[PDB]
Design a protein around this ligand. Structure first.
Ligand SMILES: *[C@@H]1O[C@H](CO)[C@@H](O[C@@H]2O[C@H](CO)[C@@H](O[C@@H]3O[C@H](CO)[C@@H](O)[C@H](O[C@H]4O[C@H](CO)[C@@H](O)[C@H](O)[C@@H]4O)[C@@H]3O)[C@H](O)[C@H]2NC(C)=O)[C@H](O)[C@H]1NC(C)=O
Ligand SMILES: *[C@@H]1O[C@H](CO)[C@@H](O[C@@H]2O[C@H](CO)[C@@H](O[C@@H]3O[C@H](CO)[C@@H](O)[C@H](O)[C@@H]3O)[C@H](O)[C@H]2NC(C)=O)[C@H](O)[C@H]1NC(C)=O
Ligand SMILES: *[C@@H]1O[C@H](CO)[C@@H](O[C@@H]2O[C@H](CO)[C@@H](O)[C@H](O)[C@H]2NC(C)=O)[C@H](O)[C@H]1NC(C)=O
Ligand SMILES: *[C@@H]1O[C@H](CO)[C@@H](O[C@@H]2O[C@H](CO)[C@@H](O)[C@H](O)[C@H]2NC(C)=O)[C@H](O)[C@H]1NC(C)=O
Ligand SMILES: *[C@@H]1O[C@H](CO)[C@@H](O[C@@H]2O[C@H](CO)[C@@H](O)[C@H](O)[C@H]2NC(C)=O)[C@H](O)[C@H]1NC(C)=O
Ligand SMILES: *[C@@H]1O[C@H](CO)[C@@H](O)[C@H](O)[C@H]1NC(C)=O
Ligand SMILES: *[C@@H]1O[C@H](CO)[C@@H](O)[C@H](O)[C@H]1NC(C)=O
Ligand SMILES: *[C@@H]1O[C@H](CO)[C@@H](O)[C@H](O)[C@H]1NC(C)=O
Ligand SMILES: *[C@@H]1O[C@H](CO)[C@@H](O)[C@H](O)[C@H]1NC(C)=O
Ligand SMILES: *[C@@H]1O[C@H](CO)[C@@H](O)[C@H](O)[C@H]1NC(C)=O
Ligand SMILES: *[C@@H]1O[C@H](CO)[C@@H](O)[C@H](O)[C@H]1NC(C)=O
Ligand SMILES: *[C@@H]1O[C@H](CO)[C@@H](O)[C@H](O)[C@H]1NC(C)=O
Ligand SMILES: *[C@@H]1O[C@H](CO)[C@@H](O)[C@H](O)[C@H]1NC(C)=O
Ligand SMILES: *[C@@H]1O[C@H](CO)[C@@H](O)[C@H](O)[C@H]1NC(C)=O
Ligand SMILES: *[C@@H]1O[C@H](CO)[C@@H](O)[C@H](O)[C@H]1NC(C)=O
Ligand SMILES: *[C@@H]1O[C@H](CO)[C@@H](O)[C@H](O)[C@H]1NC(C)=O
Ligand SMILES: *[C@@H]1O[C@H](CO)[C@@H](O)[C@H](O)[C@H]1NC(C)=O
Ligand SMILES: *[C@@H]1O[C@H](CO)[C@@H](O)[C@H](O)[C@H]1NC(C)=O
Ligand SMILES: *[C@@H]1O[C@H](CO)[C@@H](O)[C@H](O)[C@H]1NC(C)=O
Ligand SMILES: *[C@@H]1O[C@H](CO)[C@@H](O)[C@H](O)[C@H]1NC(C)=O
Lengths: 441, 117, 116, 442, 105, 436
């Protein structure tokens, strides 16, 4: 004598792939007035990021199959591309350039690094000149710009800022985001300390390779995470327990040369350099880096053996985007060496200076059909960033050895977001229960 | 909100009715995705309300009805599915044939109406 | 779904649930689909609001306090609920639909104010 | 009296209506541009017993909507493609004579010209082949221009787009339904006594052609002739065959493709040299099927023109190739075939080879503010299609002693999309109404 | 429609069905703004119904609740402006009363 | 505290109204919603509503919509960048009257054609206002190399049609029917409507042409009457008819400028060359001002002398009366109208006009439209329905007030019709104490 009864408001949910909305706090769009992030992720949030603890709930998480990562990746690309649509197309610059070397008060570390180029710019022609970095100019003393034969170069608009601000992803009604609070969670499998939230904690969409800057830190220990740690085709994301401070600069005091190339269409060229010309560079504390790397090794040996030799080595060959520390400082684009950071063998005066290159024609997101030109920044650039995680890869062939080699590397971008979104899962709420079984009318 | 996994208690279903307050709490390029999300939120709301309506459960959180429980669906008696099992587990146990129970609920309400009108 | 369309008026009364079930649900293509979903909701809500105004919310069949006017039709119940279908009926009383609906709204307005 | 108003929701009634239909399809095509909607594995028909409904294939809503959607998709697919505007230069064109058969002596030209390069300060000299239909004289002398360089920009169609028709199923949302006529001879308009309800259409391939309709549906048992005001010449005549006729078409020349970079990320695909000898493109229709097929049409046709007269077939009237010839799209190549070899007969009340012309500059929606350049295909083309119907017209006049002459017609794409969508109509479900009963109080 | 706006609070209660029905009954690229407008209109409609739902007034035009005597010389657009600063308290109280009424189920 | 739904209340709100019209025109292809053949209005007995025409968001929306449509219409058109070349002119002296000496010049130039490797030499006429001499006489277009100059499409009409703005669901538009309402403050006799009346989007400067007339005397509306920084909008009771012409029988040469592009050049004038002009009935104009003056005295004193004078300065857009007749652009001299002193105690006025082709539409620097020529003789007739006036900064040190024509900002033209309308949001849910 059992009967169907219907219950609405039942605490049941299912894994789901949906569209999350992007939100920011109420000050971000008052201060960062022309910032794309604040402008578009305009929904106010975080008055209180209140969690609901789920007593006795075990939930399975998987950071490498997380749709939140794929959505963020797409949202970042889409916004970036939309932001450049109304910007000046630098097609008048695809002419033969005549260049000479800048030899004026230059250091020995930059001979041949800067070039002084001139050309005939669009019934009228005007001879103009500007400075370019070696990386953007290819010989054909006749030269042309890189990415002038395969794609158009779009000048980034100087009125819009891309400076990262925290971004919160928020569930639409009918959905919820679950968090894994287990400390020392390795990105996969069951999590027993779980809570429910409306939005994520706020992730800054910082773009870098090899070293991950301005992210969150591990609570107790360095955490090594990978899809398959015994493979070689997978990257290892290392989340640090403490941040490492890195101080970067572009010491040259630059000027800006504004050239009109059409009806309100302006091109911004590097004008000249005030004072001595010196190499861009980044510093880290030597002592801090040494301790930090030692912590990484201690938590890495657990997967390789405590009698296994762990050595670090620098990157393999390839384009600068993957072989160097791709990094954005002050709005300028840096490509730092890093070989001074990953050069040691671990067996069971106070700083490191990394030289950096500067490049103005940038091919973002590993695409090749588009190129962006970064307008010069006047004055001197200095920034201080926090290294919060590393991306390492492992050499194969170790079967015939007692030593493993780890190298910095990886430029897929998704990994820079997997490192922050690893603790979140999206679930659909299914409030209607049909038949717990109890009574007749 | 999702405050419990304390077996199939059911004594505090009011808490999740906040998802029925979902609308009260509220250059286009990718704004389409956001527009689609708003439309879907509305459709989900309306579909649950339509379904409770067609079954004769509208306006209630706990609806005691006229469809008998079958042993072909689940035969765990009662303590097993009330004191010891959670809602997530229960949903798994009766994950299949929900369209059967739902179809029966609609037939029952149609009969109740024809017998009154 | 519409299988009962050729059946008589009193027969088709058994498929009201069947049709109600599919009235809400059942890059050029993308925009068409979004527009179609919005329309489905708008039409659905207009019909449900109207039942609400008439005091018939939540029911597929409801009776109200409105006498059938002898001028709307001149046919026996044995001739209305049988011997014809709803398509035919709808055409026969088509010119009074807005009258009947106005009366239904007024009758419920009175029923409701009478309750304080 | 004592009858009272009772309100019923979920009532099976409807009215004719115009709504938006959406795409569904089965498992880089322009006909499936995010058509991420499956069809049912069983798009089950619901038969409506005792329902008779009125259909009208003319003045429908589905035909115009289909036409609009096709043009929109077409344009959307061409938007993100290379413009060939920079190629409107003077061409230096001579005759292609090496290994050319007699039929082809003047058909192709070898044109050299100045073209742009990646850099603004550089120029290159290139050459390509052209069909004479795409190249005209500037004044008189080897100086030529492309046919549309005084009309519109020419957009190169994007490579990796096949444009091959996929049956498209049109589906009605929510409270709308598509009613289908299951009669065998409903004859375009009027009541259909055997109907059913469906949610989506059967799947219509958007085949674009003129005069002869290819790869459509066949009539059941007998030929069906449909025309609005058939005893006129004002409207055309649509003939649906009850059997197919195969037509075998080819472009026998082993053409090649010459890829030329014209700018920073832009490529032009030129017709290159031809390997082997050059022959004329053509279509083959078997006499063994055509004569019988045409005779069946005539027998059915001679109902409306009296049962005692002579029916004649003749060729098309003068005009543009898009209306005077039979247009095909095979492998992406555009053919303009001569059908006077088919429509030449006298019917008394008792292998056909069609030469073809080819074009690369296309204006298919009868618009001239746009034009498309069809890239060359690096290979030899053969296709066999099913003729499933005809669009015919007739001569006007009066005192001709009941002599009837029929000619190929059409060219208006909305009439190809009446060969399908003639059995379907969209209605709006209006599931709310009232009726009297013995229920005196609320 | 709004013809009763200038009359009196009491009498205007007799036109509630007119106003309720008239608020629901009513190439493509720029038009996205109109599509957004349609969606927003639907949400506004549902917002009111959703408040009636949580307050326990669903399906009604005149709802009796559990929370001087003029109604003649004052009209809507006067009286309701005077309580604008008190109204949010009332809405909170209406929800709270229903939350307690829900105990009896 | 009873909850009621369907309560007749509202609050002021800013929303987007949609355009509708009666049944190639720029508004006709936008305002695609047909209007109601029999629009209804609901009188609200005993409803007083505060109106403020100077804070009317409907005006701001219309302003934005008009500009947007105009710009969108000009996107798929010919850029005239290819024509920024040295031009070589000779003064045209071919049977030109005295008042037209120096107005037209005939330049030869080297322009593009169908093929990019060919050039053609053409000749065309220009109005002096569009051409600048560079120091044979060499010429360039005004702002030849700094502005983006776009040819208007010959296929689009900008003739104003009486477009209506309509409320979206949830909103209503209220009208002020008070015959003497001065633009601000409470209004009795308020009605509810779904759509505004049809308002022709007429573009003008000093004189407001076409639209509605006041029923009871001349009505003078301003935001702050004692503030000389504000314009005065004066609405007339009877229109003043103006007969305007472009008397020269001009021709048009359609020449090829690109592969699928045509440029329209002014060709040889077929007939004799005369000055463009507008005719104002003299007696009507004098009566019209007398009515305006009486109403001005009500604000400035019944013992105050009222004087009219021409514009104090500025460019053509504010110093002349500008308008568009059939696509042609006129800049007329109104000093012949605003020249009198009013004492408390069969003829006509001809206003000479200039024609200009490159238009700095909506006063945006760097953006201009090239108006193609129109062949034949052009005539139009228009109604002066109102005036825009300003006063001289003479403080209080005078017994005479001097009024001059205004112009410039377009929002003030649209305020002349959208002054009686207000948009409100309907809020049907509310509560009240009852015995239940
Ligand atoms: C104030 O209102 C008045 C009307 O009360 C308005 O004057 C009217 O303007 C229109 C447009 O300028 C005039 O109509 C034209 O008349 C000529 C006569 O030859 C026609 O050729 C014109 O036709 C065009 O469009 C055709 C479309 O097929 C083309 O084929 C043709 O080639 C032309 O391009 C058009 O019909 C109308 O005659 C006057 N009215 C009077 C009485 O003269 C006035 O413009 C408004 N005020 C303002 C400032 O706008
Ligand atoms: C990691 O976070 C730090 C901040 O916590 C980022 O550095 C900050 O970057 C902004 C923008 O580049 C700097 O703003 C500048 O301030 C000067 C003040 O005189 C002003 O003149 C400039 O116009 C500009 O507004 C800010 O000063 C700087 N903070 C510090 C301490 O230097 C850092 O860039 C982030 N890292 C990465 C990789 O994004
Ligand atoms: C880059 O090259 C330009 C020439 O192309 C140099 O400009 C000249 O500098 C001298 C310095 O005495 C001036 O007198 C000339 O008038 C300048 N020429 C022009 C065109 O302006 C410029 O100095 C070089 N800059 C660097 C960093 O090498
Ligand atoms: C990185 O460290 C170097 C030192 O190794 C810093 O360079 C010194 O800067 C001081 C400034 O007063 C000079 O007096 C020294 O002569 C410089 N030393 C050398 C070797 O050049 C450098 O500034 C640091 N960079 C950053 C970003 O802080
Ligand atoms: C009618 O249908 C036939 C059969 O699908 C089409 O011809 C085929 O097209 C594909 C395209 O990839 C080729 O691979 C086949 O080899 C073709 N068939 C033959 C016999 O060669 C035909 O093109 C369709 N007709 C039209 C006008 O589109
Ligand atoms: C710049 O200096 C480098 C030094 O190695 C030399 O190889 C190069 O040829 C020089 N280039 C120019 C343009 O002078
Ligand atoms: C500009 O063009 C002239 C043409 O004679 C050439 O001599 C000169 O080298 C060019 N200048 C540059 C910087 O390319
Ligand atoms: C993490 O940092 C704390 C100090 O904050 C330190 O005591 C602890 O040993 C560090 N974790 C590891 C793995 O060394
Ligand atoms: C970075 O700069 C700060 C001062 O702004 C200094 O205290 C700190 O030691 C520097 N860090 C490194 C790694 O050089
Ligand atoms: C890595 O370091 C070695 C020296 O140990 C050097 O030869 C090699 O070029 C470096 N590679 C990169 C990408 O820095
Ligand atoms: C549902 O059916 C599948 C069929 O393979 C079965 O494995 C699963 O256990 C069933 N679930 C329930 C709740 O009966
Ligand atoms: C059609 O009519 C027959 C009687 O002629 C009846 O038995 C059958 O049920 C009807 N069909 C429907 C759908 O009611
Ligand atoms: C050469 O071209 C002309 C074009 O008019 C044509 O008439 C002639 O027959 C051609 N000669 C050939 C194919 O030898
Ligand atoms: C068949 O079609 C013709 C077309 O003109 C029409 O006149 C005729 O009435 C139709 N026949 C029937 C039975 O509807
Ligand atoms: C047409 O028939 C001829 C007969 O000689 C044959 O050579 C040719 O290949 C056929 N063409 C097609 C397309 O079948
Ligand atoms: C078309 O080709 C097929 C073989 O693929 C052949 O059987 C058929 O007879 C040919 N048709 C014609 C008209 O020649
Ligand atoms: C308006 O006020 C007058 C005052 O005498 C009153 O008689 C009349 O009934 C009022 N109108 C309405 C709609 O209440
Ligand atoms: C056109 O170009 C020729 C080139 O010799 C020049 O002489 C002539 O003056 C140019 N025309 C104009 C109007 O400048
Ligand atoms: C009207 O103008 C005077 C100055 O002429 C100013 O003091 C006064 O405040 C203004 N009134 C309003 C309502 O702005
Ligand atoms: C202008 O001259 C042409 C010459 O052909 C004539 O046909 C036309 O009527 C004239 N128009 C006017 C208004 O004089």
């Amino acid at each position: 004598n059992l009967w169907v009864t219907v219950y609405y408001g039942v605490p049941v949910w299912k894994d789901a792939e949906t569209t999350l909305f992007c939100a920011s706090d109420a000050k971000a769009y008052e201060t960062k007035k022309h910032n794309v992030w604040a402008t578009h992720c305009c929904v106010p949030t975080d008055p209180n990021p209140q969690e609901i603890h789920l007593e006795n709930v075990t939930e399975e998480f998987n950071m490498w199959k997380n749709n939140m990562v794929e959505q963020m990746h797409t949202d970042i690309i889409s916004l970036w591309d939309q932001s450049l649509k109304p910007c000046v197309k630098l097609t008048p610059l695809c002419v033969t350039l005549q260049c000479t070397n800048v030899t004026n008060n230059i250091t020995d570390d930059m001979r041949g690094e800067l070039k002084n180029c001139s050309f005939n710019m669009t019934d009228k022609k005007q001879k103009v000149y500007s400075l370019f970095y070696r990386l953007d100019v290819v010989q054909i003393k006749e030269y042309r710009l890189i990415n002038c034969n395969t794609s158009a170069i779009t000048q980034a608009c100087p009125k819009v800022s891309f400076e990262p601000i925290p971004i919160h992803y928020c569930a639409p009604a009918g959905f919820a985001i679950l968090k894994c609070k287990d400390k020392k969670f390795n990105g996969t499998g069951p999590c027993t300390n779980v809570s429910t939230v409306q939005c994520t904690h706020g992730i800054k969409p910082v773009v870098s390779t090899q070293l991950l800057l301005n992210g969150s830190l591990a609570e107790e220990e360095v955490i090594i995470r990978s899809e398959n740690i015994t493979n070689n085709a997978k990257n290892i994301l290392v989340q640090l327990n403490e941040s490492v401070q890195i101080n970067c600069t572009r010491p040259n005091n630059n000027t800006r040369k504004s050239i009109r190339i059409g009806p309100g269409q302006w091109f911004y060229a590097t004008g000249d350099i005030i004072g001595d010309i010196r190499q861009a560079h980044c510093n880290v504390s030597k002592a801090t880096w040494n301790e930090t790397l030692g912590k990484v090794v201690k938590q890495l040996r657990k997967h390789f053996g405590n009698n296994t030799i762990i050595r670090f080595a620098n990157s393999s060959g390839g384009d600068l985007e993957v072989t160097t520390h791709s990094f954005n400082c002050g709005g300028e684009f840096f490509y730092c060496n890093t070989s001074g950071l990953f050069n040691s063998t671990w067996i069971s005066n106070d700083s490191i200076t990394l030289p950096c290159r500067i490049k103005q024609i940038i091919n973002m997101w590993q695409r090749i059909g588009q190129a962006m030109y970064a307008p010069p920044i006047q004055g001197v650039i200095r920034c201080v960033s926090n290294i919060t995680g590393l991306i390492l890869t492992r050499d194969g062939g170790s079967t015939n050895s007692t030593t493993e080699t780890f190298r910095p590397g990886g430029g897929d971008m998704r990994d820079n977001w997997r490192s922050e979104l690893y603790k979140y899962k999206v679930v659909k709420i299914e409030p209607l229960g049909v038949a717990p079984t109890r009574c007749k009318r | 909100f999702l405050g419990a996994a304390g077996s199939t208690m059911g004594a505090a279903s009011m808490t999740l009715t906040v998802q029925a307050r979902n609308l009260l709490s509220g250059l286009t390029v990718w704004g389409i995705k956001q527009l689609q999300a708003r439309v879907l939120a509305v459709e989900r709301y309306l579909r649950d309300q339509q379904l409770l309506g067609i079954w004769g459960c509208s306006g209630k959180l706990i609806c005691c009805t006229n469809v008998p429980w079958n042993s072909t669906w689940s035969n765990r008696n009662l303590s097993e599915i009330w004191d010891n099992m959670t809602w997530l587990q229960w949903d798994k146990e009766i994950s299949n044939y929900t369209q059967i129970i739902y179809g029966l609920l609609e037939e029952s309400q149609n009969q109740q109406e024809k017998n009154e009108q």
